[PDB]
Every structure is written in structure tokens, then in C-alpha cells.
Design a protein around this ligand. Sequence first.
Ligand SMILES: CNC(=O)c1n[nH]c2ccccc12
Length: 162
Amino acid sequence: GTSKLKYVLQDARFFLIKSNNHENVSLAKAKGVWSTLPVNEKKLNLAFRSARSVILIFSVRESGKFQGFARLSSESHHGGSPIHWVLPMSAKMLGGVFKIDWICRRELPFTKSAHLTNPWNEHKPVKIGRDGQEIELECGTQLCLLFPPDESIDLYQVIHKM
Ligand SMILES: CNC(=O)c1n[nH]c2ccccc12
């Protein structure tokens, strides 16, 4: 069902993550981590302390789809087991590492979210956005509910964290 998802998403904040390649979304799905540029990592760290949940929604560029979404379970931190991200630029330019819990690892095509606009990007369709763009509450919730259920995920332990 979708009740515990709705509960997780309640009063959440959402941010559009854009990846240049599939390999980085695969590493994120395998290791439960994300790293970004410091201008974005600064935005996420502030959002993490302010919201019950901070939801990242991933799209690989030129893929035409979102690849799922995840919930931040920490602020960024430095000095961890390094992550072999594929970069255009290398290594140091990325800030710290965020720990994330995946809520949906399935894909959603842009064609299915064309009725959702994002007021914080001039009401352009929610698929339109720079890496790190915030998605307003109502658009962001409805977008997450469009994803096919990911039956391999149990939101009980995610709820145990907020
Ligand atoms: C795993 N994180 C990234 O691949 C990433 N995040 N922000 C960026 C900006 C330019 C290029 C790559 C990135």
C-alpha cells in the first residue's frame, strides 16, 4: 500500500537530483550514498536540519525518466570509504557524502509526470530543472506517488529514523 509512504512524505522537502550517467545512480542504489557539488550540499544540509524528511528524486540526463527516490538519513560527511563516482572535474570538487535510504528504486517516465508543474521553477514541468532544484511540497508528493510501488522496500525502518 501507500499509507506509510504518505506518512514518510508528510511535510517533506524534495530536491531534483540530476546525474550525468547511469553508473552514479547505480552506485547510489548499491551503497546508499549521494555526493554533490558544495552549492547543493550546502542546500541539502540546511534542508536536512529543517524538515521531517528530505527526499532526493533522481533522473539521469537524456534518459527521459526518473530512476527512483531516496530519503536523506544524515548530513554530508567527509573522510568515509571513498566512492568511485564517474565524473566529467574529478573527485575533490564534490563535497561530503550523504547517507540515504531508498524509498523507490523503480523508474518513472517523464511522459507520466507531464501534468505536474513545479512552482519553484516557474511552473515548468517538474522534470525540468537544474541539479539540486527544489520541488515544492505538493508537486513533490504527487510526483513520488506516481512511481510504481517498490515491493522490496519496507518503510518501517525509514519511519523509525524520523
Ligand atoms: C555523484 N554526484 C555527481 O555525479 C554530481 N553531482 N553534482 C554534479 C555536478 C557536475 C557533475 C557531476 C555531479
